[PDB]
Amino acid sequence: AXAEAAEKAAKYAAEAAEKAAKAXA
Amino acid sequence: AXAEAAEKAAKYAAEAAEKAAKAXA
Amino acid sequence: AXAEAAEKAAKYAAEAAEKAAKAXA
Amino acid sequence: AXAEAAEKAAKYAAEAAEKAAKAXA
Amino acid sequence: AXAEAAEKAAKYAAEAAEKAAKAXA
Amino acid sequence: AXAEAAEKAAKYAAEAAEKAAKAXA
Amino acid sequence: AXAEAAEKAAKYAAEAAEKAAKAXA
Amino acid sequence: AXAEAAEKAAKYAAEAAEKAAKAXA
Ligand SMILES: CCCCCCCCCCCCO[C@@H]1O[C@H](CO)[C@@H](O[C@H]2O[C@H](CO)[C@@H](O)[C@H](O)[C@H]2O)[C@H](O)[C@H]1O
Ligand SMILES: CCCCCCCCCCCCO[C@@H]1O[C@H](CO)[C@@H](O[C@H]2O[C@H](CO)[C@@H](O)[C@H](O)[C@H]2O)[C@H](O)[C@H]1O
């Protein structure tokens, strides 16, 4: 359960960062 | 470069959490 | 959409923090 | 106090994000 | 500079977890 | 176990950030 | 101590935002 | 405006944290 929650958190962050990266591309 | 670094780090963390979730199962 | 995703993330975090706070209550 | 502060911080972030999501309509 | 700041945050998190671990010991 | 796992993960993150700080220099 | 740590994080955030704002100026 | 708004919010957060640090002392 803790691992799954961490994964969800990390995926949220990765998606947010990807949006920013695309805006700078 | 900031956004790319965040994205890479976050993806790594997501993969590590996913692997832990699978191992814990 | 970015604000909506942030709201969902923050609610998830709040739910997890509240469960931890209730365990300590 | 740590868990209660975390819960308050997450709730503040959720309220801030919700207000932004409504404004951005 | 970003790596230095990230390192301090991670060290902070490590010490916070250590304090909890010691209380649980 | 939850505190110990968090401590271990944070130390790993700290080491990774340190390595990046050194590499960037 | 937690307030002090939070203050350092907030100051870091402020300076990072200032960096971006100056570049956009 | 986005960077400027983030800078203002972070400064507000830093001031709030500083006040808490001084009060806790
Ligand atoms: C309310 C929480 C708000 C957290 C906000 C985000 C993080 C802010 C970090 C502020 C600066 C932290 O400053 C950092 O503190 C940690 C914990 O004492 C110290 O780290 C200390 O513990 C770590 C972990 O065992 C050791 O690896 C290290 O050798 C030791 O000095 C760092 O040397 C210091 O640079
Ligand atoms: C890759 C990003 C990772 C971020 C991780 C989470 C935050 C970690 C914070 C680590 C410690 C930061 O250390 C903090 O740095 C900021 C930015 O230079 C400094 O703050 C500086 O800018 C602020 C904002 O204008 C001024 O109010 C302050 O007078 C000035 O000193 C703080 O005096 C220092 O205590």
PDB file of C-alpha atoms and ligand atoms in Angstrom:
ATOM      1  CA  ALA A   1       0.000   0.000   0.000  1.00  0.00           C
ATOM      2  CA  UNK A   2       2.750   2.506   0.846  1.00  0.00           C
ATOM      3  CA  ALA A   3       4.625   1.661  -2.344  1.00  0.00           C
ATOM      4  CA  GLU A   4       1.451   2.138  -4.407  1.00  0.00           C
ATOM      5  CA  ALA A   5       0.852   5.519  -2.823  1.00  0.00           C
ATOM      6  CA  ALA A   6       4.441   6.559  -3.490  1.00  0.00           C
ATOM      7  CA  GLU A   7       4.052   5.449  -7.100  1.00  0.00           C
ATOM      8  CA  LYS A   8       0.934   7.570  -7.496  1.00  0.00           C
ATOM      9  CA  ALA A   9       2.736  10.556  -6.029  1.00  0.00           C
ATOM     10  CA  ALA A  10       5.730  10.093  -8.272  1.00  0.00           C
ATOM     11  CA  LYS A  11       3.526   9.683 -11.365  1.00  0.00           C
ATOM     12  CA  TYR A  12       1.686  12.923 -10.530  1.00  0.00           C
ATOM     13  CA  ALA A  13       4.998  14.691 -10.273  1.00  0.00           C
ATOM     14  CA  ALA A  14       6.330  13.128 -13.453  1.00  0.00           C
ATOM     15  CA  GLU A  15       3.241  14.189 -15.413  1.00  0.00           C
ATOM     16  CA  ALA A  16       3.441  17.754 -14.051  1.00  0.00           C
ATOM     17  CA  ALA A  17       7.149  17.943 -14.869  1.00  0.00           C
ATOM     18  CA  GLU A  18       6.490  16.561 -18.380  1.00  0.00           C
ATOM     19  CA  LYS A  19       3.936  19.301 -19.002  1.00  0.00           C
ATOM     20  CA  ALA A  20       6.494  21.904 -17.960  1.00  0.00           C
ATOM     21  CA  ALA A  21       9.156  20.252 -20.116  1.00  0.00           C
ATOM     22  CA  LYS A  22       6.825  20.352 -23.107  1.00  0.00           C
ATOM     23  CA  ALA A  23       6.046  24.029 -22.513  1.00  0.00           C
ATOM     24  CA  UNK A  24       9.845  24.656 -22.653  1.00  0.00           C
ATOM     25  CA  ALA A  25      10.400  22.468 -25.726  1.00  0.00           C
TER      26      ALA A  25
ATOM     27  CA  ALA B   1      16.674  21.628 -18.008  1.00  0.00           C
ATOM     28  CA  UNK B   2      14.881  22.050 -14.544  1.00  0.00           C
ATOM     29  CA  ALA B   3      11.694  20.431 -15.832  1.00  0.00           C
ATOM     30  CA  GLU B   4      13.574  17.628 -17.584  1.00  0.00           C
ATOM     31  CA  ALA B   5      15.515  16.907 -14.367  1.00  0.00           C
ATOM     32  CA  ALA B   6      12.308  16.804 -12.345  1.00  0.00           C
ATOM     33  CA  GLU B   7      10.661  14.517 -14.894  1.00  0.00           C
ATOM     34  CA  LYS B   8      13.591  12.104 -14.921  1.00  0.00           C
ATOM     35  CA  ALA B   9      13.773  11.951 -11.159  1.00  0.00           C
ATOM     36  CA  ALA B  10      10.047  11.497 -10.747  1.00  0.00           C
ATOM     37  CA  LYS B  11       9.953   8.695 -13.338  1.00  0.00           C
ATOM     38  CA  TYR B  12      12.796   6.956 -11.546  1.00  0.00           C
ATOM     39  CA  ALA B  13      10.914   7.203  -8.263  1.00  0.00           C
ATOM     40  CA  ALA B  14       7.730   5.860  -9.872  1.00  0.00           C
ATOM     41  CA  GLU B  15       9.598   2.881 -11.308  1.00  0.00           C
ATOM     42  CA  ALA B  16      11.251   2.161  -7.943  1.00  0.00           C
ATOM     43  CA  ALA B  17       7.904   2.367  -6.109  1.00  0.00           C
ATOM     44  CA  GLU B  18       6.271   0.110  -8.694  1.00  0.00           C
ATOM     45  CA  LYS B  19       9.007  -2.485  -8.303  1.00  0.00           C
ATOM     46  CA  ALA B  20       8.588  -2.342  -4.504  1.00  0.00           C
ATOM     47  CA  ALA B  21       4.842  -2.794  -4.811  1.00  0.00           C
ATOM     48  CA  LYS B  22       5.378  -5.876  -7.010  1.00  0.00           C
ATOM     49  CA  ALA B  23       8.017  -7.302  -4.628  1.00  0.00           C
ATOM     50  CA  UNK B  24       5.878  -6.724  -1.552  1.00  0.00           C
ATOM     51  CA  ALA B  25       3.045  -8.702  -3.229  1.00  0.00           C
TER      52      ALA B  25
ATOM     53  CA  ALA C   1      -6.644  20.742 -16.008  1.00  0.00           C
ATOM     54  CA  UNK C   2      -3.388  21.466 -14.090  1.00  0.00           C
ATOM     55  CA  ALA C   3      -5.371  22.957 -11.219  1.00  0.00           C
ATOM     56  CA  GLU C   4      -7.809  20.035 -11.258  1.00  0.00           C
ATOM     57  CA  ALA C   5      -4.935  17.548 -11.102  1.00  0.00           C
ATOM     58  CA  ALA C   6      -3.280  19.462  -8.276  1.00  0.00           C
ATOM     59  CA  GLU C   7      -6.584  19.493  -6.343  1.00  0.00           C
ATOM     60  CA  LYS C   8      -6.901  15.734  -6.708  1.00  0.00           C
ATOM     61  CA  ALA C   9      -3.319  15.250  -5.607  1.00  0.00           C
ATOM     62  CA  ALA C  10      -3.791  17.514  -2.581  1.00  0.00           C
ATOM     63  CA  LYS C  11      -7.019  15.710  -1.565  1.00  0.00           C
ATOM     64  CA  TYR C  12      -5.200  12.364  -1.768  1.00  0.00           C
ATOM     65  CA  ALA C  13      -2.405  13.789   0.416  1.00  0.00           C
ATOM     66  CA  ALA C  14      -4.941  15.237   2.849  1.00  0.00           C
ATOM     67  CA  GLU C  15      -6.698  11.863   3.152  1.00  0.00           C
ATOM     68  CA  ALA C  16      -3.393  10.131   3.905  1.00  0.00           C
ATOM     69  CA  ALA C  17      -2.340  12.800   6.439  1.00  0.00           C
ATOM     70  CA  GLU C  18      -5.733  12.617   8.136  1.00  0.00           C
ATOM     71  CA  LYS C  19      -5.470   8.838   8.537  1.00  0.00           C
ATOM     72  CA  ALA C  20      -2.054   9.338  10.156  1.00  0.00           C
ATOM     73  CA  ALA C  21      -3.425  12.100  12.420  1.00  0.00           C
ATOM     74  CA  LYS C  22      -6.334   9.858  13.486  1.00  0.00           C
ATOM     75  CA  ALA C  23      -3.889   7.041  14.319  1.00  0.00           C
ATOM     76  CA  UNK C  24      -2.102   9.493  16.659  1.00  0.00           C
ATOM     77  CA  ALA C  25      -5.306  10.793  18.216  1.00  0.00           C
TER      78      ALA C  25
ATOM     79  CA  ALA D   1       1.493  18.005  15.777  1.00  0.00           C
ATOM     80  CA  UNK D   2       3.499  16.699  12.773  1.00  0.00           C
ATOM     81  CA  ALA D   3       0.588  14.784  11.333  1.00  0.00           C
ATOM     82  CA  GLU D   4      -1.905  17.565  12.110  1.00  0.00           C
ATOM     83  CA  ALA D   5       0.350  20.131  10.401  1.00  0.00           C
ATOM     84  CA  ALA D   6       0.724  17.867   7.370  1.00  0.00           C
ATOM     85  CA  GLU D   7      -3.040  17.472   7.199  1.00  0.00           C
ATOM     86  CA  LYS D   8      -3.569  21.245   7.442  1.00  0.00           C
ATOM     87  CA  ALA D   9      -0.973  21.893   4.763  1.00  0.00           C
ATOM     88  CA  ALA D  10      -2.577  19.391   2.375  1.00  0.00           C
ATOM     89  CA  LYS D  11      -6.041  20.824   2.980  1.00  0.00           C
ATOM     90  CA  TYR D  12      -4.740  24.359   2.351  1.00  0.00           C
ATOM     91  CA  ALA D  13      -3.220  23.192  -0.942  1.00  0.00           C
ATOM     92  CA  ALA D  14      -6.476  21.428  -1.918  1.00  0.00           C
ATOM     93  CA  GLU D  15      -8.501  24.618  -1.215  1.00  0.00           C
ATOM     94  CA  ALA D  16      -6.036  26.756  -3.178  1.00  0.00           C
ATOM     95  CA  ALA D  17      -6.121  24.356  -6.155  1.00  0.00           C
ATOM     96  CA  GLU D  18      -9.907  24.187  -6.108  1.00  0.00           C
ATOM     97  CA  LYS D  19     -10.159  27.987  -6.181  1.00  0.00           C
ATOM     98  CA  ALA D  20      -7.752  28.037  -9.134  1.00  0.00           C
ATOM     99  CA  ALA D  21      -9.715  25.341 -10.960  1.00  0.00           C
ATOM    100  CA  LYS D  22     -12.913  27.335 -10.562  1.00  0.00           C
ATOM    101  CA  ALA D  23     -11.258  30.593 -11.684  1.00  0.00           C
ATOM    102  CA  UNK D  24      -9.726  28.913 -14.720  1.00  0.00           C
ATOM    103  CA  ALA D  25     -13.174  27.983 -16.049  1.00  0.00           C
TER     104      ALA D  25
ATOM    105  CA  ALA E   1      22.948  24.382  -6.650  1.00  0.00           C
ATOM    106  CA  UNK E   2      19.700  22.473  -7.255  1.00  0.00           C
ATOM    107  CA  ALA E   3      21.397  19.181  -6.397  1.00  0.00           C
ATOM    108  CA  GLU E   4      22.763  20.750  -3.180  1.00  0.00           C
ATOM    109  CA  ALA E   5      19.281  21.904  -2.149  1.00  0.00           C
ATOM    110  CA  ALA E   6      17.771  18.500  -3.000  1.00  0.00           C
ATOM    111  CA  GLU E   7      20.471  16.853  -0.900  1.00  0.00           C
ATOM    112  CA  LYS E   8      19.632  19.000   2.116  1.00  0.00           C
ATOM    113  CA  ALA E   9      15.916  18.185   1.733  1.00  0.00           C
ATOM    114  CA  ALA E  10      16.674  14.470   1.507  1.00  0.00           C
ATOM    115  CA  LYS E  11      18.962  14.640   4.542  1.00  0.00           C
ATOM    116  CA  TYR E  12      16.214  16.432   6.464  1.00  0.00           C
ATOM    117  CA  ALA E  13      13.747  13.693   5.506  1.00  0.00           C
ATOM    118  CA  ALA E  14      16.274  11.011   6.502  1.00  0.00           C
ATOM    119  CA  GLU E  15      16.831  12.554   9.931  1.00  0.00           C
ATOM    120  CA  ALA E  16      13.084  13.042  10.469  1.00  0.00           C
ATOM    121  CA  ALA E  17      12.519   9.349   9.659  1.00  0.00           C
ATOM    122  CA  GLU E  18      15.419   8.388  11.923  1.00  0.00           C
ATOM    123  CA  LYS E  19      13.860  10.280  14.808  1.00  0.00           C
ATOM    124  CA  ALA E  20      10.602   8.412  14.326  1.00  0.00           C
ATOM    125  CA  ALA E  21      12.491   5.111  14.031  1.00  0.00           C
ATOM    126  CA  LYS E  22      14.358   5.748  17.268  1.00  0.00           C
ATOM    127  CA  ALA E  23      11.141   6.540  19.091  1.00  0.00           C
ATOM    128  CA  UNK E  24       9.685   3.299  17.777  1.00  0.00           C
ATOM    129  CA  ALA E  25      12.836   1.425  18.957  1.00  0.00           C
TER     130      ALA E  25
ATOM    131  CA  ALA F   1       9.347  -0.728   9.393  1.00  0.00           C
ATOM    132  CA  UNK F   2       7.560   2.392   7.933  1.00  0.00           C
ATOM    133  CA  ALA F   3      10.062   4.809   9.506  1.00  0.00           C
ATOM    134  CA  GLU F   4      13.039   2.583   8.652  1.00  0.00           C
ATOM    135  CA  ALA F   5      11.969   2.267   5.025  1.00  0.00           C
ATOM    136  CA  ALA F   6      11.467   6.001   4.750  1.00  0.00           C
ATOM    137  CA  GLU F   7      14.902   6.619   6.277  1.00  0.00           C
ATOM    138  CA  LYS F   8      16.530   4.230   3.808  1.00  0.00           C
ATOM    139  CA  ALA F   9      14.819   5.801   0.813  1.00  0.00           C
ATOM    140  CA  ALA F  10      15.723   9.314   1.934  1.00  0.00           C
ATOM    141  CA  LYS F  11      19.364   8.414   2.449  1.00  0.00           C
ATOM    142  CA  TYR F  12      19.445   6.914  -1.042  1.00  0.00           C
ATOM    143  CA  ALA F  13      17.987  10.140  -2.441  1.00  0.00           C
ATOM    144  CA  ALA F  14      20.536  12.180  -0.505  1.00  0.00           C
ATOM    145  CA  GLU F  15      23.399  10.126  -1.952  1.00  0.00           C
ATOM    146  CA  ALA F  16      22.009  10.543  -5.446  1.00  0.00           C
ATOM    147  CA  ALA F  17      21.760  14.293  -5.024  1.00  0.00           C
ATOM    148  CA  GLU F  18      25.297  14.426  -3.646  1.00  0.00           C
ATOM    149  CA  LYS F  19      26.626  12.482  -6.624  1.00  0.00           C
ATOM    150  CA  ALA F  20      24.849  14.929  -8.956  1.00  0.00           C
ATOM    151  CA  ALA F  21      26.280  17.921  -7.088  1.00  0.00           C
ATOM    152  CA  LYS F  22      29.770  16.504  -7.493  1.00  0.00           C
ATOM    153  CA  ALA F  23      29.242  15.617 -11.140  1.00  0.00           C
ATOM    154  CA  UNK F  24      27.937  19.079 -12.002  1.00  0.00           C
ATOM    155  CA  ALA F  25      31.091  20.641 -10.496  1.00  0.00           C
TER     156      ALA F  25
ATOM    157  CA  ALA G   1      12.910  23.377  14.240  1.00  0.00           C
ATOM    158  CA  UNK G   2      10.105  22.447  11.847  1.00  0.00           C
ATOM    159  CA  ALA G   3       9.248  26.116  11.385  1.00  0.00           C
ATOM    160  CA  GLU G   4      12.901  26.863  10.646  1.00  0.00           C
ATOM    161  CA  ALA G   5      13.045  24.122   8.012  1.00  0.00           C
ATOM    162  CA  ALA G   6       9.815  25.323   6.441  1.00  0.00           C
ATOM    163  CA  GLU G   7      11.168  28.865   6.340  1.00  0.00           C
ATOM    164  CA  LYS G   8      14.280  27.695   4.466  1.00  0.00           C
ATOM    165  CA  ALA G   9      12.116  25.835   1.962  1.00  0.00           C
ATOM    166  CA  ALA G  10       9.899  28.863   1.466  1.00  0.00           C
ATOM    167  CA  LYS G  11      12.922  31.119   0.977  1.00  0.00           C
ATOM    168  CA  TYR G  12      14.341  28.656  -1.562  1.00  0.00           C
ATOM    169  CA  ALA G  13      11.016  28.742  -3.409  1.00  0.00           C
ATOM    170  CA  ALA G  14      10.950  32.527  -3.296  1.00  0.00           C
ATOM    171  CA  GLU G  15      14.433  32.820  -4.768  1.00  0.00           C
ATOM    172  CA  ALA G  16      13.660  30.273  -7.477  1.00  0.00           C
ATOM    173  CA  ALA G  17      10.552  32.225  -8.422  1.00  0.00           C
ATOM    174  CA  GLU G  18      12.485  35.491  -8.341  1.00  0.00           C
ATOM    175  CA  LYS G  19      15.070  33.976 -10.729  1.00  0.00           C
ATOM    176  CA  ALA G  20      12.326  33.136 -13.188  1.00  0.00           C
ATOM    177  CA  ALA G  21      10.630  36.511 -12.742  1.00  0.00           C
ATOM    178  CA  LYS G  22      13.849  38.389 -13.438  1.00  0.00           C
ATOM    179  CA  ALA G  23      14.445  36.412 -16.591  1.00  0.00           C
ATOM    180  CA  UNK G  24      10.901  37.183 -17.721  1.00  0.00           C
ATOM    181  CA  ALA G  25      11.460  40.893 -16.977  1.00  0.00           C
TER     182      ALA G  25
ATOM    183  CA  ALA H   1       2.670  37.255 -13.426  1.00  0.00           C
ATOM    184  CA  UNK H   2       2.971  33.507 -12.636  1.00  0.00           C
ATOM    185  CA  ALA H   3       6.550  33.753 -11.342  1.00  0.00           C
ATOM    186  CA  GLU H   4       5.746  37.001  -9.542  1.00  0.00           C
ATOM    187  CA  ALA H   5       2.724  35.462  -7.883  1.00  0.00           C
ATOM    188  CA  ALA H   6       4.716  32.408  -6.803  1.00  0.00           C
ATOM    189  CA  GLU H   7       7.443  34.655  -5.405  1.00  0.00           C
ATOM    190  CA  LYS H   8       4.902  36.657  -3.405  1.00  0.00           C
ATOM    191  CA  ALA H   9       3.246  33.520  -2.025  1.00  0.00           C
ATOM    192  CA  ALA H  10       6.599  31.986  -1.069  1.00  0.00           C
ATOM    193  CA  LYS H  11       7.662  35.150   0.723  1.00  0.00           C
ATOM    194  CA  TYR H  12       4.344  35.122   2.589  1.00  0.00           C
ATOM    195  CA  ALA H  13       4.986  31.501   3.578  1.00  0.00           C
ATOM    196  CA  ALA H  14       8.520  32.332   4.727  1.00  0.00           C
ATOM    197  CA  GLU H  15       7.259  35.171   6.897  1.00  0.00           C
ATOM    198  CA  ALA H  16       4.607  32.888   8.435  1.00  0.00           C
ATOM    199  CA  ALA H  17       7.205  30.218   9.169  1.00  0.00           C
ATOM    200  CA  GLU H  18       9.594  32.775  10.657  1.00  0.00           C
ATOM    201  CA  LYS H  19       6.837  34.084  12.950  1.00  0.00           C
ATOM    202  CA  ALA H  20       6.120  30.542  14.083  1.00  0.00           C
ATOM    203  CA  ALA H  21       9.817  29.910  14.744  1.00  0.00           C
ATOM    204  CA  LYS H  22      10.074  33.044  16.904  1.00  0.00           C
ATOM    205  CA  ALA H  23       6.841  32.230  18.777  1.00  0.00           C
ATOM    206  CA  UNK H  24       7.849  28.631  19.448  1.00  0.00           C
ATOM    207  CA  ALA H  25      11.112  29.929  20.962  1.00  0.00           C
TER     208      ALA H  25
HETATM  209  C1  LIG I   1       8.283  21.129   8.416  1.00  0.00           C
HETATM  210  C2  LIG I   1       9.147  20.422   7.422  1.00  0.00           C
HETATM  211  C3  LIG I   1       9.473  21.327   6.235  1.00  0.00           C
HETATM  212  C4  LIG I   1      10.558  20.598   5.355  1.00  0.00           C
HETATM  213  C5  LIG I   1      10.871  21.458   4.161  1.00  0.00           C
HETATM  214  C6  LIG I   1      11.776  20.885   3.111  1.00  0.00           C
HETATM  215  C7  LIG I   1      13.233  20.581   3.542  1.00  0.00           C
HETATM  216  C8  LIG I   1      13.989  21.809   4.088  1.00  0.00           C
HETATM  217  C9  LIG I   1      15.429  21.465   4.451  1.00  0.00           C
HETATM  218  C10 LIG I   1      16.133  22.595   5.209  1.00  0.00           C
HETATM  219  C11 LIG I   1      17.640  22.352   5.450  1.00  0.00           C
HETATM  220  C12 LIG I   1      17.939  21.004   6.094  1.00  0.00           C
HETATM  221  O1  LIG I   1      19.345  20.996   6.488  1.00  0.00           O
HETATM  222  C13 LIG I   1      19.841  19.678   6.559  1.00  0.00           C
HETATM  223  O2  LIG I   1      19.317  19.110   7.782  1.00  0.00           O
HETATM  224  C14 LIG I   1      19.694  17.705   7.884  1.00  0.00           C
HETATM  225  C15 LIG I   1      18.987  17.136   9.113  1.00  0.00           C
HETATM  226  O3  LIG I   1      19.446  17.773  10.285  1.00  0.00           O
HETATM  227  C16 LIG I   1      21.235  17.615   8.057  1.00  0.00           C
HETATM  228  O4  LIG I   1      21.577  16.231   7.809  1.00  0.00           O
HETATM  229  C17 LIG I   1      21.958  15.489   8.967  1.00  0.00           C
HETATM  230  O5  LIG I   1      21.275  14.235   8.937  1.00  0.00           O
HETATM  231  C18 LIG I   1      21.533  13.446   7.757  1.00  0.00           C
HETATM  232  C19 LIG I   1      20.655  12.178   7.824  1.00  0.00           C
HETATM  233  O6  LIG I   1      21.080  11.316   8.867  1.00  0.00           O
HETATM  234  C20 LIG I   1      23.022  13.094   7.631  1.00  0.00           C
HETATM  235  O7  LIG I   1      23.210  12.411   6.402  1.00  0.00           O
HETATM  236  C21 LIG I   1      23.841  14.385   7.684  1.00  0.00           C
HETATM  237  O8  LIG I   1      25.220  14.059   7.693  1.00  0.00           O
HETATM  238  C22 LIG I   1      23.460  15.225   8.895  1.00  0.00           C
HETATM  239  O9  LIG I   1      24.164  16.437   8.882  1.00  0.00           O
HETATM  240  C23 LIG I   1      21.911  18.355   6.868  1.00  0.00           C
HETATM  241  O10 LIG I   1      23.313  18.438   7.150  1.00  0.00           O
HETATM  242  C24 LIG I   1      21.361  19.793   6.762  1.00  0.00           C
HETATM  243  O11 LIG I   1      21.924  20.436   5.617  1.00  0.00           O
HETATM  244  C1  LIG I   2      15.950  21.102  -6.685  1.00  0.00           C
HETATM  245  C2  LIG I   2      15.073  21.787  -5.673  1.00  0.00           C
HETATM  246  C3  LIG I   2      14.915  21.023  -4.386  1.00  0.00           C
HETATM  247  C4  LIG I   2      14.281  21.871  -3.276  1.00  0.00           C
HETATM  248  C5  LIG I   2      14.148  21.053  -2.000  1.00  0.00           C
HETATM  249  C6  LIG I   2      13.374  21.699  -0.880  1.00  0.00           C
HETATM  250  C7  LIG I   2      14.015  22.974  -0.351  1.00  0.00           C
HETATM  251  C8  LIG I   2      15.368  22.777   0.329  1.00  0.00           C
HETATM  252  C9  LIG I   2      15.918  24.065   0.940  1.00  0.00           C
HETATM  253  C10 LIG I   2      17.420  23.906   1.274  1.00  0.00           C
HETATM  254  C11 LIG I   2      18.000  25.100   2.027  1.00  0.00           C
HETATM  255  C12 LIG I   2      17.678  26.443   1.354  1.00  0.00           C
HETATM  256  O1  LIG I   2      18.423  27.492   1.994  1.00  0.00           O
HETATM  257  C13 LIG I   2      17.722  28.754   1.822  1.00  0.00           C
HETATM  258  O2  LIG I   2      18.099  29.207   0.493  1.00  0.00           O
HETATM  259  C14 LIG I   2      17.403  30.452   0.194  1.00  0.00           C
HETATM  260  C15 LIG I   2      17.585  30.714  -1.284  1.00  0.00           C
HETATM  261  O3  LIG I   2      18.945  31.034  -1.567  1.00  0.00           O
HETATM  262  C16 LIG I   2      17.994  31.556   1.081  1.00  0.00           C
HETATM  263  O4  LIG I   2      17.112  32.687   1.021  1.00  0.00           O
HETATM  264  C17 LIG I   2      17.549  33.828   0.282  1.00  0.00           C
HETATM  265  O5  LIG I   2      16.457  34.227  -0.535  1.00  0.00           O
HETATM  266  C18 LIG I   2      15.267  34.606   0.165  1.00  0.00           C
HETATM  267  C19 LIG I   2      14.168  34.926  -0.872  1.00  0.00           C
HETATM  268  O6  LIG I   2      14.425  36.191  -1.506  1.00  0.00           O
HETATM  269  C20 LIG I   2      15.539  35.819   1.062  1.00  0.00           C
HETATM  270  O7  LIG I   2      14.316  35.982   1.832  1.00  0.00           O
HETATM  271  C21 LIG I   2      16.684  35.393   2.019  1.00  0.00           C
HETATM  272  O8  LIG I   2      17.049  36.513   2.771  1.00  0.00           O
HETATM  273  C22 LIG I   2      17.933  35.002   1.193  1.00  0.00           C
HETATM  274  O9  LIG I   2      18.932  34.549   2.135  1.00  0.00           O
HETATM  275  C23 LIG I   2      17.957  31.114   2.571  1.00  0.00           C
HETATM  276  O10 LIG I   2      18.683  32.059   3.361  1.00  0.00           O
HETATM  277  C24 LIG I   2      18.551  29.731   2.725  1.00  0.00           C
HETATM  278  O11 LIG I   2      18.332  29.312   4.102  1.00  0.00           O
END
